[PDB]
Amino acid sequence: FLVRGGMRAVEFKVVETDPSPYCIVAPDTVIHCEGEPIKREDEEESLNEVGYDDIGGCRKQLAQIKEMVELPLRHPALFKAIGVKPPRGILLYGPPGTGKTLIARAVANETGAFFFLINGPEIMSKLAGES
Amino acid sequence: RPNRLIVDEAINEDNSVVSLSQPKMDELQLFRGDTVLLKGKKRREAVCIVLSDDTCSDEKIRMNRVVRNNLRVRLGDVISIQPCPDVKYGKRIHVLPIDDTVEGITGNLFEVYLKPYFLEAYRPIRKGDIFLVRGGMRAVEFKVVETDPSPYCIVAPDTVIHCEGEPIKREDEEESLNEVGYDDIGGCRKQLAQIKEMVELPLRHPALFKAIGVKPPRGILLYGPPGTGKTLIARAVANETGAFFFLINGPEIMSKLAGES
Numbered sequence: 001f002l003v004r005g006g007m008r009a010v011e012f013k014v015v016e017t018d019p020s021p022y023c024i025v026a027p028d029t030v031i032h033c034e035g036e037p038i039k040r041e042d043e044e045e046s047l048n049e050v051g052y053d054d055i056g057g058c059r060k061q062l063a064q065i066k067e068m069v070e071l072p073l074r075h076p077a078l079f080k081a082i083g084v085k086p087p088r089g090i091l092l093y094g095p096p097g098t099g100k101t102l103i104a105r106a107v108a109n110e111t112g113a114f115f116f117l118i119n120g121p122e123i124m125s126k127l128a129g130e131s
Numbered sequence: 132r133p134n135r136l137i138v139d140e141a142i143n144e145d146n147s148v149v150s151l152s153q154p155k156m157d158e159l160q161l162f163r164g165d166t167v168l169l170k171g172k173k174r175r176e177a178v179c180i181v182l183s184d185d186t187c188s189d190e191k192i193r194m195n196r197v198v199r200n201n202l203r204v205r206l207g208d209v210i211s212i213q214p215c216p217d218v219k220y221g222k223r224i225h226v227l228p229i230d231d232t233v234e235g236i237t238g239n240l241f242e243v244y245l246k247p248y249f250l251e252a253y254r255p256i257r258k259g260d261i262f263l264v265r266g267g268m269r270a271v272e273f274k275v276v277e278t279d280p281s282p283y284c285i286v287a288p289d290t291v292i293h294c295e296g297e298p299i300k301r302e303d304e305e306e307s308l309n310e311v312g313y314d315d316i317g318g319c320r321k322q323l324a325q326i327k328e329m330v331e332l333p334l335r336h337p338a339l340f341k342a343i344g345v346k347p348p349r350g351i352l353l354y355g356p357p358g359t360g361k362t363l364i365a366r367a368v369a370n371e372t373g374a375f376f377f378l379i380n381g382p383e384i385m386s387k388l389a390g391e392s
C-alpha cells in the first residue's frame with residue numbers, strides 16, 4: 001500500500017499480523033515501524049511508473065488509442081483466429097512537449113508489452129554505414 | 132469433333148453450374164439439370180449440372196473457378212463434355228478438411244458448413260475433387276475421399292456424412308486456392324481487357340507468333356494513384372496465364388550498400 005506524504009511517495013509492506021491474515025486497523029492496536037527496509041519483491045509491480053491516471057487533457061485521444069490498440073495486444077489468439085488485418089502503424093503529431101512519449105509509455109505499461117524505444121538522433125549519429 | 136469446347140470465365144459463382152448456349156443443347160440433346168461428365172488434362176475428372184445461359188457463344192463454355200481447378204486446366208484450353216445419365220443417388224460420403232484452412236476453428240464443422248451447403252442441392256460429386264464452402268469469416272475447403280457408389284453419386288437426404296478425422300495435408304499439383312484470380316478485380320473492366328489483349332497471346336502460346344514473326348511487347352507501364360491495385364492486376368495476370376511472377380521491390384534495391392545493387 002502507498003501513502004502520500006511530504007514531498008515524495010512512500011509505500012509500505014506488511015509482513016505479518018494477528019489474527020492472520022485478515023484484520024482491520026483499530027484505534028487500540030500496537031504498530032511497529034522499526035526494522036531495516038526490505039528489498040523489492042522481484043515481480044516489478046512498481047507503482048512509481050506511469051499509468052492512465054498520469055495523463056490529463058487528452059481524454060478523446062486516449063480513448064481512440066485504447067480503442068484501436070487494446071485488442072491486438074491483449075488478445076492475439078482470438079484476433080488471429082478471426083483473420084482480419086490489424087493496424088501496423090500509428091502517428092502521433094503535435095507541438096513538442098505535449099506528452100506523446102508519456103502516452104506510449106502508459107499504454108505499454110498498462111496493457112502489458114515490451115516497450116522498446118528508438119531515438120532519432122541516437123540512430124543518426126552512429127558513424128559509417130553501421131546505422 | 133463437335134463435342135469439345137474451350138473454357139471461359141463464368142458469371143454464376145455456384146460450385147456446380149456450367150453455362151452452355153441453347154444451340155449446343157439442341158445439337159447434343161441436352162436438357163436442363165442433367166448430369167454431364169467433364170474430361171480434361173492430367174486425366175482428371177469431375178461432374179456438374181448444366182444451366183441455360185445465352186451470353187456465352189456456342190463454341191464457348193462458361194465455368195467457375197473451383198471446377199476449373201478441379202480439372203487442372205486454365206482458361207483458354209479445351210475440355211470434353213457429354214451427357215452422363217447413369218448416375219444414381221449416393222449412400223455414404225467421407226469428407227475431410229484441408230490443413231491450412233481450418234487453423235483455429237475447433238467446432239462442429241458438420242452443422243456449420245456442410246449442412247447448409249448440401250441442403251436441398253442435389254450436388255453431384257466425384258471422388259478426389261476439392262470444393263470450397265463459405266462460412267463465418269473464412270473459407271474452408273473439403274476434399275471428398277470416399278463415396279458410394281464410386282466415383283459418381285448425388286446428394287440425397289438419407290446419405291451418411293462423416294466429418295471426423297485428422298485434416299489432410301496440402302497436395303502439390305493442387306493449384307492452391309486463395310491466390311488472386313480474375314474475380315478479385317472489380318471496376319477495372321476496360322483496362323483489364325486491354326492488358327489481357329496483348330499479354331495472353333505471347334504468354335499462352337510462345338512459339339507460334341515467333342515462328343510467324345512479329346514484335347511482341349516488351350514493357351507495359353501501369354500508372355495511377357497509390358492504392359488502386361496495380362500489383363493485384365499484375366499478380367492476377369501472372370497466376371492466370373501461367374508464369375513465374377518475380378517481384379523486385381523499389382526500396383530493397385536502394386537499401387543495399389551501393390556496389391551490390
Ligand SMILES: Nc1ncnc2c1ncn2[C@@H]1O[C@H](COP(=O)(O)OP(=O)(O)O)[C@@H](O)[C@H]1O
Binds near residue numbers: 095097099100
Ligand atoms: N497529463 C500530462 N499531459 C501532458 N504532459 C504531461 C502530463 N503529465 C506530465 N507531463 C509532462 O510531459 C513531459 C513529456 O516529455 P516528452 O517525452 O518530452 O514529451 P514529448 O516527447 O511528447 O515532447 C513529461 O516530462 C511530463 O513532466
Ligand SMILES: Nc1ncnc2c1ncn2[C@@H]1O[C@H](COP(=O)(O)OP(=O)(O)O)[C@@H](O)[C@H]1O
Binds near residue numbers: 358359361362363
Ligand atoms: N478490385 C480491386 N480494385 C482495386 N483495389 C483492390 C481490389 N480488390 C482489392 N483491392 C485492394 O488493393 C490492395 C492491393 O493493392 P496495392 O498492391 O497496394 O496497389 P499499389 O501497391 O499499386 O497501391 C489489396 O490490399 C486490396 O485490399
